[PDB]
Write a protein that binds this ligand. Structure first.
Ligand SMILES: Nc1nc2c(ncn2[C@@H]2O[C@H](COP(=O)(O)OP(=O)(O)OP(=O)(O)O)[C@@H](O)[C@H]2O)c(=O)[nH]1
Ligand SMILES: [Mg+2]
Lengths: 570, 165, 415, 10, 585, 142
């Protein structure tokens, strides 16, 4: 079958070899193994057709690795096609030469690339600038040997800022691939040249020349303000990617501004309406935008501490946006916006997405932890959500009201009078044991605390380690609170824990509780009934040493993941 | 699934025992000028039977089944001592083919109701079945109206077809 | 910084593939749809999937997955915005974007993907300038490809010279079930259709509050532009200086400015409704629709959607003005009023049934979304003041404008 | 297509 | 009211499920508004389209009223589609299926055997135990008849009502007597399945049913000596389905009897020779034969031939027969433990098979193959296999090594050596239930804890992400630090036990989030243990307890408070209650 | 005891489900999607046996449409393959050169061949003639 195609290829008519190579790239389109037809479409490459050679370059790109030995038959044709009156075919051959990653080929590919660097047309110059980074990705030290770094710096020193912007993109790539040996930071005069290059180059070039600014730090108050005054109009651009990198460099450079000067507050108040406006983008950018907002409101919480109405989710929003808007509402929940946030989260447990409702109940809990003012309104709202008696809603609300009781155990003693009836056939062990802590911890305003645990002590030996250990602690606490009624209960739970159970920490805490009860049970009023301190909660603010490293990465995969970059790259 | 012939000299009873294998009957059968074909589902191996008659004009016509041919049955007529020589010459004419080498030989000693019929040993002597290189052969005493020896031949043929326990 | 740009079908095989750096192997795209179903069924559906050290940035078309793979720390919004620009350019080229366009027009699309990106770097992503040297019907590349002004090529000439302005309002609204407004913002977007000759320059005049405060005329009617995000063509340094919208226009249809502001004016169409949810019998939608705006504008072709129970049956609609089609395919109704004037109230009474047996799972309560469209009306009151055509030749173009009030996500929450 | 094939091939 | 196949073509003309659900809900609302008109003519195709929606998985819960109405119809096709919808949309937990009782009962009294066939069909497929108690008086009545189309359905419906109500099987004992000469092999197949079920349920029924052993011996001999049948016949056997069922009833009967096991002796000796290992069916016959031999108390001379059969079944290149031979030797583990042990190289050779199931069965077969002699050489290749496993095999293998080592350990030193090697090479793949088992056996050890805990500390210094490893190690340190750190109350000549990194390794487990917080429970328990086991470096772990008093976990906060009160207030009670924990079994 | 009968295509589309154990519809979708994921992700020299969740599962590839059952893990395993092969011959004899579209368009007849061949999980007719004759007689009633 392929011999017929090679016979069409080995003819001399243009329309035959043209349909032949179109059938080749159509087989390659669905992914047929047309690698065997390599060294004969190599011969049918040097054509006067410009539409045909793009297909051939596509084949050579898709099969450079496939034939590492047969690929030597193209270098003369590349150095010929880089000597053409048409700059489209020259830049086409240059961007073909860069993507071909064969180390046997790229030795002879230095000097025509050097010539196309020194071409007149900016199209082939900005192609060859990216091809320098292509070759540095192939062989970095061959680029260092040829001295293409200085020519890359000379295309920084070029006019017509698209060549300059591709040079800055290539330099950011190569200096990223550097060990920062001979770091290519600029004097501020070339940086002001890039500022003159800013209002002229492409909106993609306006991203990469803002990416060089992630590697430079200004030294003065007037220098930083002077460059940021023209960094500032980039926030009013339609593409969110120019705005995001401008936000990145402004977050980088606002640590140089004098806060006592009125330019810093000018930067603050002019930054927040673009950050609110970026939420109206198309939602795959809104995911990274919400992660970067979380990166900013941890860095500067004063920016969006008055814009709560825009972080309300909508019905059309997907899960990866609705779950992150909850986290931003956590990071921005304050004293005055309590009613809208709590009624908003009240309308979030009414959804069919189970994990969204679980995250919403955890958001109400983190609201009750973060502020002490509306902890009571969180308690009332969560009890009214318990009044729904939806199973996973209760399985989250028990743990959440528990963690409210762990931080603030003070004035919540009439709340547990309802919580005794909370669908006692609850199944999930993370909230069964949570309810065991709620009972035994608050076993002085709960009068029927013994007889409810009789259900919890029946199927005792196969629940968990956590649930059995919470029972083992809560019964000792209950019996210390009432020694009369649960006299048999503490003895039978010590008999179930010590003797027959082989759960090792449950055994150890059982023998400890039994030796405490036998040694001095009155001393448990000071030992296990010791005054618990205020529990240091898990504050999820990212380390400012790591956060300033993540100021330097906004718009990256590390910006999304809220990780250092080396934690996930390979 | 496998194919098989029923050839030989005419009036030997091979179509009589063919419809004895197909239906269990001894039907009125003319001396067969054309051919016959039936199929017998025996031991879940469909023995696809292709009778070709034994008239003088149709003996050279045997080659136009001999393309894509797997087995063979050579039904002899025991009672014809004078025509068993020309049946032997017909057999060795059929066995002198480069194409007929996968066809295992199956000799049906037919009309084993008469005392003038030979045994399954004298027919082997008169044919010389022992000098048959590349020929898995087996002689079998068969009778039409009883049906004895037929399913023994089908048993040995089914042993020849499959190569399993 | 993606090493390989991919487009998959809805099953997961390659519609079209385009590698750039070799950092992502070509066989690693086969894991995408299993990872898609693996993360999707656990609620971890994200635009970034991962297979060990290989990432999967993706946006989703109706039939197409624009998979963008990277291995190192790629610049992410770079990648996603380039995916959106590829979608926009291919929609300009192929007005329907399906597998018939991929598997049959494969002559041009590989050339397009080679031109738009090299080494993972977007270089020239405008549609109209790319038309001029990439055709399916080749000369040197234009200098506008290499120009600083890379959105308007010289040599464009028309007989008449017309500039069409489209001021399109979009009222965003999220009214709670109690009946108060949680968020009343307006995202406004001006789209222009410019048919001029040569290299013109346009200065847009608007009734800005900030610009009139710079002038001293901030006591008349004006618009409070809380934020504006412009096109690339607008010289944004001059707008930062003195609120000046200075731009060489692109040729043809383009969106100039996408502004956003907050508006404490009452909503345009108020939807009050009561729902008598009886067990296993029926439901009732005594919905009323009043208009709070002036008695001179008429809302064209509204579609007031009320989400209904999924297994409802025998639909009944005692309406007053406007037709209803019950849409059970989306589980909703469409109460369509073609001519909806201002200051009027039109009642609709719906009545359904309900099966006697309950369902295994719940259904959810989606808010009410209507689809109004009002011409010759801006709720913000924003008005274009002037548009000065600047040309070395010098002529009189025709700046025409119409005012359109539409919706964005006009949501009102249900009981 | 690949659907018009009979299963057992009798 | 479109046809069923029209909706089939409508859904097959959908590409995207986001559009296919729209096409579902269009015709679904059509069916719903059709059911509001109470139409009994198109109700067949409306319920059929609704069942086509349920088959792909679309909401069809509402259309069960009309399924009951199709059962409450009078035409044959309406009842047919109604019983189809009853078997598909209704089950035990549907809560509305109790209304089928009267309708199936009248259709068990329907004149047609096919409508009674459907009333037996739906009741046998999904008849609830409450419906079994309401219909089994009429199930046996259709067993009190003799219609061979109905007896085969009534027998397996009796199997179903035993399956749902096993205390109702006593009324089918007088109904099953001496119908065991029925010539219809389908009725005979259902009767042998019923006898296999009845013999499976109650031993009181065995004595009534081990009497009719020679009757079914004659039946099986008649079926084996049956050379050919036109129907019932795949691969030259007259009804091998009924042959396997009779051999299975022979397998469960006589398994502890001697008279009946020798009453079935000669037919087993025949069918071990009158089978055929060529196609799948005769290998099935012969494997059920060898199962019947190895499960009854047979002659061991039968078992000589049967182990010869299974040695042939190991030799067969069919992966079917390799699975069968592994399942075979997995069945005859305790029965003939000697002759299976000489298949050991083949059992180990089946570990390198390219199938998950064959590796699993050969792994469990090497596990059950362990005796008090093969513990040395086999465990080396078994742990080599665990090192060369896949993450799905690691839990089962990590459990099976422990279970075969807890029985047949030749040396308690080498026992703990194999256990520690598994705890290194498995890590986070062994089940946490085996962790108190390992704890219980190493505290059943009494003479070697130096060699235990020194090697524990030598291994766990490199790793703590192996979670059950440190689940073991924290309790090991907390109980035997005195044997770990030995005679080192102050600073001496440098021995590798250092009593400052001994606490710091547990503290580093504590600070690291690679901790399931019962890691932290075990670790704080070890910290409170080692205040009396160690007098070397104290009042530094009290610092850890006092700074740990505000941790975020609930029980760990309780644990830190209840420790810190003892470490600051009742130091005289700490050493009083820190005796080692006693040994249970 | 056969606990379930499943018939799923190569693409994963469910063509016939059957439950001889009454487990609810969410569990039906969970178990069905799991089994579809397991069998489609296994090679062609893997004995057609899976030990999945206390079940020696019996599946078989006859075409792109895959067939699946699970006998109780105390019984013989090859006879379940013979059951599926006998039911293949039943569909071939009642339908006639049984296509996929014969199973697609006329699925309810395949359900009824299953009903007249197996109730409760066990074989109720071992004849390959009496069962198809009886379903043609019930069709003759119509
Ligand atoms: N008595 C008796 N006659 C037999 C027996 N077998 C064959 N014959 C006779 O042989 C005759 C042969 O009939 P056919 O079956 O047509 O002979 P053939 O071998 O097929 O010869 P063609 O039809 O020409 O191919 C029959 O009519 C019988 O009379 C036998 O076992 N006993
Ligand atoms: Mg004849």
């Amino acid at each position: 079958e392929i011999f017929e195609l090679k016979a069409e290829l080995n003819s001399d008519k243009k329309e035959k070899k043209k349909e032949a190579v179109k059938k080749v790239i159509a087989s390659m389109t669905v992914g047929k193994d047309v690698s065997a037809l390599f060294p004969d479409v190599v011969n049918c490459m040097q054509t006067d057709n410009l539409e045909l050679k793009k297909l051939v370059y596509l084949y050579l790109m898709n099969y450079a690795k496939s034939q590492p030995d047969m690929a030597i038959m193209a270098v003369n044709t590349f150095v010929k096609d880089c000597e053409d009156p048409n700059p489209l075919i020259r830049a086409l051959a240059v961007r073909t030469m860069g993507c071909i990653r064969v180390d046997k080929i790229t030795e002879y590919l230095c000097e025509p690339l050097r010539k196309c660097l020194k071409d007149e047309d900016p199209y082939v110059r900005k192609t060859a600038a990216v091809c320098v980074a292509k070759l540095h990705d192939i062989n970095a030290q061959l680029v260092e040997d040829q001295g293409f770094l200085d020519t890359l710096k000379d295309l920084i020193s070029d006019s017509n800022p698209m060549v300059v912007a591709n040079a800055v993109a290539a330099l950011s790539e190569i200096a990223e691939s550097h060990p920062s040996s001979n770091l290519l930071d600029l004097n501020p005069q070339s940086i002001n040249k890039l500022l003159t290059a800013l209002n002229e180059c492409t909106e993609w070039g306006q991203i990469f020349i803002l990416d060089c600014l992630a590697n430079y730090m200004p030294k003065d108050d007037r220098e930083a303000q002077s460059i940021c005054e023209r960094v500032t109009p980039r926030l009013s651009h339609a593409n969110s990617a120019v705005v995001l990198s401008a936000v990145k460099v402004l977050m980088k450079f606002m640590e140089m501004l004098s806060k006592d000067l009125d330019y810093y507050g000018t930067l603050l108040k002019k930054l927040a309406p673009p950050l609110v406006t970026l939420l109206s983008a198309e939602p795959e950018l809104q995911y990274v935008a919400l992660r970067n907002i979380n990166l900013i409101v941890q860095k500067r919480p004063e920016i969006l501490k008055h814009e709560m109405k825009v972080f309300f989710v909508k019905y059309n929003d997907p899960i990866y946006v609705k779950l992150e808007k909850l986290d931003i509402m956590i990071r921005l929940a304050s004293q005055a916006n309590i009613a809208q946030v709590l009624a908003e989260l009240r309308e979030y447990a009414t959804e069919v997405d189970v994990d969204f409702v679980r995250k919403a109940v955890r958001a109400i809990g983190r609201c009750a932890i973060k502020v002490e003012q509306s902890a009571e309104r969180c308690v009332s709202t969560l009890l009214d959500l318990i009044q729904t008696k939806v199973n996973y809603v209760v399985q989250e609300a028990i743990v959440v009201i528990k963690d409210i009781f762990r931080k603030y155990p003070n004035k919540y003693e009439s709340v547990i009078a309802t919580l005794c009836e909370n669908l006692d056939s609850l199944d999930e062990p993370e909230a069964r044991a949570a309810m065991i802590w709620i009972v035994g911890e608050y076993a002085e305003r709960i009068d029927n605390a013994d007889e409810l645990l009789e259900s919890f002590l029946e199927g005792f030996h196969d629940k968990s380690t956590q649930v059995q250990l919470q029972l083992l602690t809560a019964i000792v606490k209950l019996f210390l609170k009432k020694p009369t009624e649960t006299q048999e209960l503490v003895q039978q739970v010590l008999s179930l824990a010590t003797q027959d159970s082989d759960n090792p920490d449950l055994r150890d805490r059982g023998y400890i509780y039994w030796r405490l009860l036998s040694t001095d049970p009155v001393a448990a009023k000071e030992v296990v009934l010791a005054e618990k301190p205020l529990i240091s909660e898990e504050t999820d603010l990212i380390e400012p040493t790591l956060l300033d490293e993540l100021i330097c990465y906004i718009g990256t995969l590390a910006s999304v993941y809220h990780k250092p970059p080396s934690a996930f790259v390979e | 699934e496998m194919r098989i012939l029923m050839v030989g000299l005419d009036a030997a009873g091979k179509t009589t025992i063919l419809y004895k294998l197909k239906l269990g009957e001894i039907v009125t059968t003319i001396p067969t000028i054309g051919f016959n074909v039936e199929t017998v589902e025996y031991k879940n191996i469909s023995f696809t039977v292709w009778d070709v008659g034994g008239l003088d004009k149709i003996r050279p016509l045997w080659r136009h089944y001999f393309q894509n041919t797997q087995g063979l049955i050579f039904v002899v007529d025991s009672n014809d001592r004078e025509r068993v020589n020309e049946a032997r010459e017909e057999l060795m004419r059929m066995l002198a083919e480069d194409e007929l080498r996968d066809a295992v030989l199956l000799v049906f000693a037919n009309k084993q109701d008469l005392p003038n019929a030979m045994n399954a040993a004298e027919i082997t002597d008169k044919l010389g079945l022992h000098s048959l290189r590349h020929r898995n052969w087996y002689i079998q005493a068969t009778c039409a109206t009883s049906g004895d020896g037929l399913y023994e031949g089908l048993d040995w043929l089914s042993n020849q077809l499959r190569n399993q326990k | 910084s993606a090493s390989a740009v991919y487009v998959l079908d809805l099953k997961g095989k390659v519609l079209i593939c385009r590698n750039y750096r070799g950092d992502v192997d070509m066989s690693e795209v086969e894991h995408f749809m299993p990872i898609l179903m693996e993360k999707e069924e656990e609620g971890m559906l994200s635009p970034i999937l991962a297979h060990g050290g290989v990432r999967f940035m993706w946006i989703k078309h109706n039939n197409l997955y624009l998979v963008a793979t990277s291995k190192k720390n790629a610049c992410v919004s770079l990648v996603f915005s380039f995916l959106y620009k590829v979608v926009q350019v291919f929609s300009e080229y192929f007005k329907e974007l399906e597998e018939e366009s991929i598997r049959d027009n494969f002559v041009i699309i590989y050339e397009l993907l080679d031109e738009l990106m090299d080494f993972g770097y977007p270089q020239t992503t405008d549609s109209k300038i790319l038309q001029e040297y990439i055709t399916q019907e080749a000369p040197r590349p234009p200098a506008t490809v290499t120009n600083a002004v890379s959105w308007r090529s010289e040599g464009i000439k028309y007989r008449k010279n017309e500039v069409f302005l489209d001021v399109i309002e979009a009222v965003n609204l999220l009214v709670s079930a109690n009946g108060n407004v949680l968020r009343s913002e307006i995202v406004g977007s001006i789209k222009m259709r410019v048919f001029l000759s040569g290299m013109p320059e346009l200065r847009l005049g608007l009734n800005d509050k900030v610009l009139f405060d710079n002038t001293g005329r901030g006591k008349s009617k004006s618009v409070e532009l809380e934020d504006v995000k412009f096109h690339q063509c607008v010289r944004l340094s001059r707008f930062e200086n003195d609120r000046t919208i200075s731009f060489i226009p692109p040729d043809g249809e383009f969106e100039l400015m996408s502004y956003r502001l907050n508006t404490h004016v009452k909503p345009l169409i108020w939807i009050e409704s009561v729902i008598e949810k009886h067990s296993h019998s029926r439901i009732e939608y005594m919905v009323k629709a009043k208009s709070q705006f002036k008695r001179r504008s008429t809302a064209n072709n509204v579609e007031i959607h009320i989400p209904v129970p999924n297994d409802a049956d025998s639909p009944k609609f005692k309406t007053t003005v406007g037709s209803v089609k019950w849409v059970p395919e989306n589980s909703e109704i469409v109460w369509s009023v073609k001519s909806f004037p201002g200051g009027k109230e039109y009642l609709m009474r719906a009545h359904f049934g309900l099966p006697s047996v309950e369902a295994e799972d719940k259904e959810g309560k989606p808010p009410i979304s209507v689809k109004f469209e009002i011409p010759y009306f801006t709720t913000s009151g924003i008005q274009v003041r002037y548009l000065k055509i600047i040309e070395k030749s010098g002529y009189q173009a025709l700046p025409w404008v119409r005012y359109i009030t539409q919706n964005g996500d006009y949501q009102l929450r249900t009981q | 297509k690949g659907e018009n094939t009979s299963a057992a091939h009798p | 009211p479109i046809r069923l196949r029209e909706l089939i073509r409508t859904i097959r003309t959908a590409r995207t499920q986001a559009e296919e659900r729209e096409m579902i809900q269009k015709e679904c609302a059509a069916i719903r508004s059709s059911f509001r008109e109470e139409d009994n003519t198109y109700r067949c195709r409306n319920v059929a389209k609704l069942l086509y929606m349920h088959m792909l998985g679309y909401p069809a819960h509402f259309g069960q009223l009309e399924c009951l109405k199709l059962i409450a119809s009078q035409k044959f096709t309406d009842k047919r589609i109604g019983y189809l919808g009853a078997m598909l949309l209704l089950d035990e937990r549907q809560d509305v299926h109790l209304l089928m009782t009267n309708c199936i009962k009248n259709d068990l009294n329907h004149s047609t055997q096919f409508v009674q066939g459907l009333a037996l069909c739906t009741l046998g497929c999904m008849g609830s135990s409450e419906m079994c108690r309401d219909l089994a008086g009429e199930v046996e009545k259709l067993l009190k008849t003799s219609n061979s189309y109905l007896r085969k359905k009534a027998a397996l419906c009796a199997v179903h009502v035993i399956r749902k109500v096993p205390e109702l099987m006593e009324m089918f004992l007088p109904a099953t007597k001496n119908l065991l000469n029925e010539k219809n092999h389908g009725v005979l197949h259902t009767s042998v399945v019923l006898l296999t079920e009845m013999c499976e349920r109650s031993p009181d029924m065995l004595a009534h049913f081990r009497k009719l052993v020679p009757q079914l011996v004659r039946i099986l001999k008649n079926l084996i000596m049956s050379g050919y049948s036109p129907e019932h016949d795949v691969s030259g056997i007259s009804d091998p389905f009924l042959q396997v069922r009779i051999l299975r009833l022979l397998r469960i009967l006589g398994r502890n009897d001697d008279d009946s096991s020798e009453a079935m002796n000669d037919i087993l000796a025949q069918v071990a020779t009158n089978t055929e290992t060529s196609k799948n069916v005769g290998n099935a016959i012969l494997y059920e034969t060898v199962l019947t031999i190895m499960d009854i108390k047979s002659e061991s001379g039968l078992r000589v031939l049967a182990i010869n059969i299974l040695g042939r079944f190991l030799l067969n290149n069919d992966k079917n027969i390799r699975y069968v031979a592994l399942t075979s030797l997995l069945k005859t583990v305790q029965t003939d433990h000697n002759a299976v042990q000489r298949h050991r190289s083949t059992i180990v050779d089946c570990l390198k098979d390219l199938d998950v199931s064959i590796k699993r069965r050969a792994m469990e077969l090497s596990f059950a193959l362990v005796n008090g002699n093969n513990i040395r050489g086999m465990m080396k290749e078994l742990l080599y296999f665990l090192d060369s496993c896949e993450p799905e095999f690691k839990a089962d293998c990590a459990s099976g090594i422990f279970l075969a080592a807890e029985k047949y350990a030749p040396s308690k030193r080498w026992h703990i050596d194999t256990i520690m090697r598994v705890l290194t090479t498995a890590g986070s793949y062994v089940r946490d239930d085996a962790v108190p088992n390992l704890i219980q056996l190493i505290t059943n050890s009494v003479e070697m804890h130096a060699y235990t805990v020194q090697r524990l500390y030598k291994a766990i210094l490199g790793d703590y992400s192996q979670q059950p490893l440190v689940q073991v190690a924290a309790w090991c340190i907390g109980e035997y630090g005195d044997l770990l750190v030995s005679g080192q109350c102050e600073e001496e000549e440098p021995i590798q036990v250092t009593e400052d990194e001994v606490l710091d390794i547990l503290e580093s487990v504590l600070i690291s989030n690679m901790s399931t917080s019962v890691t932290r429970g075990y670790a704080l328990t070890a910290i409170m243990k080692l205040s009396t086991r160690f007098t070397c470096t104290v009042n530094r772990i009290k610092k850890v307890v006092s700074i740990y008093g505000s941790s975020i976990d609930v029980e760990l906060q309780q644990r830190a408070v209840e420790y810190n009160a003892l470490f600051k207030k009742y130091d005289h009670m700490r050493s009083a209650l820190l005796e080692r924990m006693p040994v249970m079994e | 005891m056969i606990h379930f009968i499943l018939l799923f295509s190569r693409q994963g589309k469910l063509r016939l489900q059957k439950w001889y154990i009454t487990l609810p519809d969410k569990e039906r979708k969970k178990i069905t999607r799991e089994i579809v994921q397991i069998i489609l992700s296994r090679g062609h020299r893997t004995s057609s046996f899976v030990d999945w969740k206390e079940l020696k599962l019996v599946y078989k590839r006859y075409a792109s449409l895959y067939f699946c059952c699970a006998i109780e893990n105390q019984d013989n395993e090859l006879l379940t393959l013979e059951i599926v092969h006998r039911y293949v011959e039943l569909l071939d004899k009642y339908f006639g050169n049984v296509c996929e579209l014969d199973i697609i368009f006329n699925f309810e007849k395949a359900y009824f061949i299953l009903d007249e061949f197996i109730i409760g999980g066990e074989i109720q007719e071992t004849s390959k003639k009496i069962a198809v004759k009886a379903i043609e007689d019930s069709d003759m009633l119509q």
